[PDB]
Amino acid sequence: RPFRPFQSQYRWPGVDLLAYKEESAPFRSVTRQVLFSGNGLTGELRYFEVGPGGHSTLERHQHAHGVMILKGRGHAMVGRAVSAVAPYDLVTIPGWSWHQFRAPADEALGFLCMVNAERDKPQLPTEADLAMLRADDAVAAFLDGLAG
Amino acid sequence: RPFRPFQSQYRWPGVDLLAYKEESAPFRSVTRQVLFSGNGLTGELRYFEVGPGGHSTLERHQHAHGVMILKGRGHAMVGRAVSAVAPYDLVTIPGWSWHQFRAPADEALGFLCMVNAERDKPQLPTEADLAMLRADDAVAAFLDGLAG
Numbered sequence: 005r006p007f008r009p010f011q012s013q014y015r016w017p018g019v020d021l022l023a024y025k026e027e028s029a030p031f032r033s034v035t036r037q038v039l040f041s042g043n044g045l046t047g048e049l050r051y052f053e054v055g056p057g058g059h060s061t062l063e064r065h066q067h068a069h070g071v072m073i074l075k076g077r078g079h080a081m082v083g084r085a086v087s088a089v090a091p092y093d094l095v096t097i098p099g100w101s102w103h104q105f106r107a108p109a110d111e112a113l114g115f116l117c118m119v120n121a122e123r124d125k126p127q128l129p130t131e132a133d134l135a136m137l138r139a140d141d142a143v144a145a146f147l148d149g150l151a152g
Numbered sequence: 153r154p155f156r157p158f159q160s161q162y163r164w165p166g167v168d169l170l171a172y173k174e175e176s177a178p179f180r181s182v183t184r185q186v187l188f189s190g191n192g193l194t195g196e197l198r199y200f201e202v203g204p205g206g207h208s209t210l211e212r213h214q215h216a217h218g219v220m221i222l223k224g225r226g227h228a229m230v231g232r233a234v235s236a237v238a239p240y241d242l243v244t245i246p247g248w249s250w251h252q253f254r255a256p257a258d259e260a261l262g263f264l265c266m267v268n269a270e271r272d273k274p275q276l277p278t279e280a281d282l283a284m285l286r287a288d289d290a291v292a293a294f295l296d297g298l299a300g
């Protein structure tokens with residue numbers, strides 16, 4: 005503990021915070037807040053916050069995502085596109101693309117994520133999936149934590 | 153022209169800007185950008201920017217809005233609730249509520265607005281509507297430009 009880094013957190017009091025329980029977990033240092041759901045809105049707007057050195061789950065599913073970076077910076081992969089991201093970049097994630105957000109070692113990443121209210125469950129990669137993904141050099145670099 | 157105020161503008165190049173043509177118009181100094189639509193997303197995410205001293209159209213309709221303030225500050229009315237707003241406040245607008253956003257004289261107001269892709273056309277108030285609205289003191293104060 006010679007170094008204890010600062011980290012602000014974005015909150016809207018009255019909206020519940022879900023901190024995800026880590027164990028063998030495919031994610032790391034993630035919280036979610038649901039900003040808009042219900043009211044006959046067919047969409048949901050969520051806010052995800054990924055703590056320093058964390059990541060969202062590498063996954064895919066039928067439903068699309070529209071992401072707008074809201075806080076900090078980090079990296080995203082969609083399909084085999086890897087990019088650095090910062091507020092308020094738009095990340096468009098078409099149905100079935102593999103995707104993941106990664107926070108740098110020194111900073112949290114926050115982003116808005118719009119999805120359909122009615123939607124399928126995420127699927128995680130098999131060993132085969134990971135190996136096809138890793139055949140790209142930038143993708144392997146991203147998954148190794150080395151995109152910066 | 154002794155004073156020419158600064159005003160930054162939020163843009164995502166590749167997304168079209170719609171500047172609304174003013175005449176007898178119920179709005180003033182408004183632009184829109186559609187950040188997410190299509191991809192089997194049943195929602196749209198738009199970005200509205202209201203220039204200093206401007207306002208969105210005072211209207212109502214069946215479809216709900218979820219608004220997140222993104223830039224500057226200003227005032228909002230929903231139903232008879234009037235509040236000051238600033239980034240990244242959430243404004244929830246239930247179906248059929250009268251609503252309007254107002255930019256201060258000295259600053260632009262920017263906000264995200266999530267709606268359903270399939271939705272009804274806005275309705276503007278009749279003289280009767282305005283008079284029922286104006287029966288509240290804070291609402292009349294807001295519509296007179298005096299909420300600050």
Ligand SMILES: [Mn+2]
Nearest residue numbers: 063064065126
């Ligand atoms: Mn996903």
Ligand SMILES: [Mn+2]
Nearest residue numbers: 211212213274
């Ligand atoms: Mn409206």
